[PDB]
Design a protein around this ligand. Sequence first.
Ligand SMILES: O=S([O-])[O-]
Ligand SMILES: O=S([O-])[O-]
Ligand SMILES: [Ca+2]
Length: 489
Amino acid sequence: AANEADYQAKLTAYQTELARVQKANADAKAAYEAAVAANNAANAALTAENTAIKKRNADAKADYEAKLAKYQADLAKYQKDLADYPVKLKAYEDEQTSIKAALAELEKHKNEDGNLTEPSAQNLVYDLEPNANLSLTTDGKFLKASAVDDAFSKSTSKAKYDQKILQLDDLDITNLEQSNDVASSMELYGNFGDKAGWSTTVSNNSQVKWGSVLLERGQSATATYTNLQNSYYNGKKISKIVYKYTVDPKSKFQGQKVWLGIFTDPTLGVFASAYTGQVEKNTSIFIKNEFTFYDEDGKPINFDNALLSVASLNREHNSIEMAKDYSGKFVKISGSSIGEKNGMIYATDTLNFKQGEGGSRWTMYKNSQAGSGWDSSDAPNSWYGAGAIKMSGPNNYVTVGATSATNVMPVSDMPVVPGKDNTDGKKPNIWYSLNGKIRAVNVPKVTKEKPTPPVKPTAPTKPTYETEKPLKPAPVAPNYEKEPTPPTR
Ligand SMILES: O=S([O-])[O-]
Ligand SMILES: O=S([O-])[O-]
Ligand SMILES: [Ca+2]
């Protein structure tokens, strides 16, 4: 009995110890699972972040190399410009000396025929741009080239047309006013393509092209000329010119429509016409011109006394071509028929059509007389019908047109040409251009631009790389307690 009681005591003790170890190991296992979960979470995040780090580093490296490529090009350009600076500076300084010496000599001839009364160098080189590109917008109507061709082949310009000549001042615009003459985009017309070899009143047999529009008073057309090759301001290349042509509401032509032919070469200007077949008394046609020149960077050029040539200002016994409402200051050419009066630039005191008529010194067209044919691009004395306007600022303007003499002054104050009636009607049309081809003699031109120290580029910022992190080692498994041994009876 004592042994049995002793045995049961040990059995109970044993079973209690067993249960203790079991619970203890259960808690241990739970703690190990918690450590395992924490370790797995840690390595999951480390693995994911490492993948992310590899990607960020790759992108960083790629962006950096992309930047070095642009920088390398910029730096090479910088070092080149830096090396060329002295050469450009000498060229500039050397031309500046020459021009100043040239102006000094001119000062002594400023009152001789053909000389600008105010000696000045032409900082604006803008004389010929045959390869310029013309883009037009308008609040009027674009005219189809086929319609322009048809108009030239009919009415008053037909005779010349049939002789392979495009006579712009004879074009009857009546045939450009039909609704079916309107185009959706600008179309070029001229003595090219199927009409290569033809002549026109603009540049004889040289090829010219123009876009056409039909405008009413107050309406305009804006021309954007690009692809310029030979124009500069103070040696700085001119890359673009934006020019707006507006029909002056004050124009007195009888019609309500105007045809504008805008040449692709900006230096050739424009032809404006309200002519419908018959001459008109007390008539006029004026076109407002607003323009801005731009540099290679597309920035507006702020002129500092740029010389604008105003030439071919014809004055017949019944007609006066003039420039007015202009920005800038008029500069007279000594000996020229052109002067300024009441805000208008024109032949103020004499006519300039035929020698001996109304005080004209020379005949505008070529004939048997010395000096005849002054009204031509290459005439030695074209200055006889020209002047200049010194302009400053990026936005300039001037209105150019033709008007009956009777609109400008009383009949009693006009020159008398025996056999000619000063009240004769005229055609309400005109061709004119505004460029830098100063007609005065021996005018020095600026061709060397003053150089500016190049801007040194900035090397790209070194890439910021991150280090990947090592995974954490798995937690060590706990050492569970061993079970107690069963007692024996
Ligand atoms: O000028 S090309 O278009 O004949
Ligand atoms: O100008 S006419 O006399 O040749
Ligand atoms: Ca003219």
